[PDB]
């Protein structure tokens, strides 16, 4: 049956932590998709799929957008899409982590912050998670498609301007975290996070950053990064997750957006079209049979 489509989502989850087995069992009930979802350790929020047949498949990864800054009118930094074609062998296990949006600073359910949103530290949006599609070979994870998330918007961001998409296809380059300042940089592919507000690398579990203690100790405006890798927010915006996490400003500059992450496509696979910011919310993965 080559007409089959498997659609991977957040299974209903949002924020810096990913979903449970019971959420995905609910979201995927009465479909062709069945998955195993880790409960603990670095694989906790990650969905495990079994490839049904040896064949060529389309795999399109979409990462998550970063949050809004200090004004309801701002546009978000949309997550990056990465479309590839891959040959897979029956019974391969694919591990899938669907990125979750960075926390918005606006709108707010607090009517005292909502005043600000409609017209000091803490207005910047959170970083937002990348989407990861990888596989195990010899016990070490191997990446196939990583669709970076979008950096968070600064509290006082004035222009809806964003930088061109970055795509790597070279494992020898290290997939490190982005720089953190007052705001958390984005989680990369393999690193050692130690700050509370920086996004975690995938192999650490990819939990999204806490917001900055400068914000949370005094004013209480919370903007966390998203599953997986989303950097925490301050006045500055947080960096988005990727193979390499997007950078956050070195100071708490309120005009400085977090950078998007760097995406990744295995060179053994075939890229279909350049990477492109399209996603306005959470991420997504789509898998179909390919006609050749």
């Amino acid at each position, epitope marked *: 049956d080559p007409t089959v489509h498997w659609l991977f989502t957040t299974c209903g989850a949002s924020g810096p932590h990913g979903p449970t087995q019971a959420q995905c069992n609910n979201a995927y009930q009465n479909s062709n998709l069945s998955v195993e979802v880790g409960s603990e350790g670095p694989l906790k929020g990650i969905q495990i799929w079994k490839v049904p047949a040896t064949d060529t498949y389309s795999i399109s990864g979409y990462g998550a957008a970063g949050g809004k800054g200090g004004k309801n009118t701002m546009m978000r930094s949309h997550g990056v899409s990465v479309l590839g074609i891959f040959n897979l062998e029956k019974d391969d296990m694919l591990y899938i982590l669907v990125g979750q949006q960075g926390e918005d600073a606006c709108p707010s359910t607090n009517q005292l*912050i909502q005043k600000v949103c409609i017209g000091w530290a803490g207005g910047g949006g959170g970083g937002g998670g990348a989407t990861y599609v990888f596989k195990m070979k010899d016990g070490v994870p191997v990446p196939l498609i990583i669709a970076a998330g979008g950096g968070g918007r600064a509290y006082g961001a004035k222009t809806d301007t964003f930088h061109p998409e970055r795509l790597e296809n070279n494992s020898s380059v290290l997939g490190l975290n982005g720089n953190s300042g007052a705001a958390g940089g984005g989680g990369g592919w393999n690193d050692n996070t130690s700050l509370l507000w920086a996004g975690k690398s995938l192999q650490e579990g990819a939990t999204g950053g806490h917001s900055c*203690p400068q914000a*949370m*100790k*005094k*004013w209480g405006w919370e903007t966390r990064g998203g599953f997986g890798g989303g950097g925490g927010g301050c006045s500055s915006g947080g960096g988005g997750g990727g193979y390499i996490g997007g950078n956050a400003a070195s100071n708490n500059d309120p005009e400085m957006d977090g950078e998007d992450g760097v995406s990744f496509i295995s060179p053994l696979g075939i890229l279909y079209t350049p990477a492109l910011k399209v996603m306005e919310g959470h991420g997504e993965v789509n898998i179909k049979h390919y006609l050749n």
Partner: antibody
Amino acid sequence: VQLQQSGAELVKPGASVKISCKASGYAFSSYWVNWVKQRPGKGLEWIGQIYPGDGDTNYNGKFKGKATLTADKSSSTAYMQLSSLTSEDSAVYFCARSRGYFYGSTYDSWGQGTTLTVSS
Amino acid sequence: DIVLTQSPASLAVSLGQRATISCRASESVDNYGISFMNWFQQKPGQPPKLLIYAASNQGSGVPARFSGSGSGTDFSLNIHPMEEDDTAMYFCQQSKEVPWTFGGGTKLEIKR
């Protein structure tokens, strides 16, 4: 969002207790945890607070060295240890989370309370 | 300390009637354009529950009959119309300056 406290304690004068407050459903390291004492026929008393992220503390001078506040990030648990107990320490003790300036720096989520009784 | 003088200590009210509780502070509790006066309800055997934060703002799921007023050193909690389920202790509270302090409380009881 839940704070869940440990059970009651009945102890002799001179002893110590350590009351636990286990947090869930939010980022333990980003909010202040407050402690409050309530006795019959009295109001509420603020004992102090702790910020688990970096161990910062603020005390009510009336309770310094009587209450000792700590936080354990591994378990997301806030403790209060009461030393050199007397009959004036017999009370119900609450832990409570507070939010920042935008929320009036006020409490928004309370443990169920812990009853201490001190008698010889 | 910032001392809160809550009045009255006891108050009896018929169903439907207006109940007014006052809290006066020894110094202004305004800072950054916010008033750090807050109001709480506590029934027997329960922890306290937030009614009003920053002097004027409804807490989540707090019915409309509760409302807070004031700024600086004078503040007020109004309940109207009074319902049976409002009998409880009521406390004011400031967070402007350490140490955080409570008013002395008001016990709200039914009149007969």
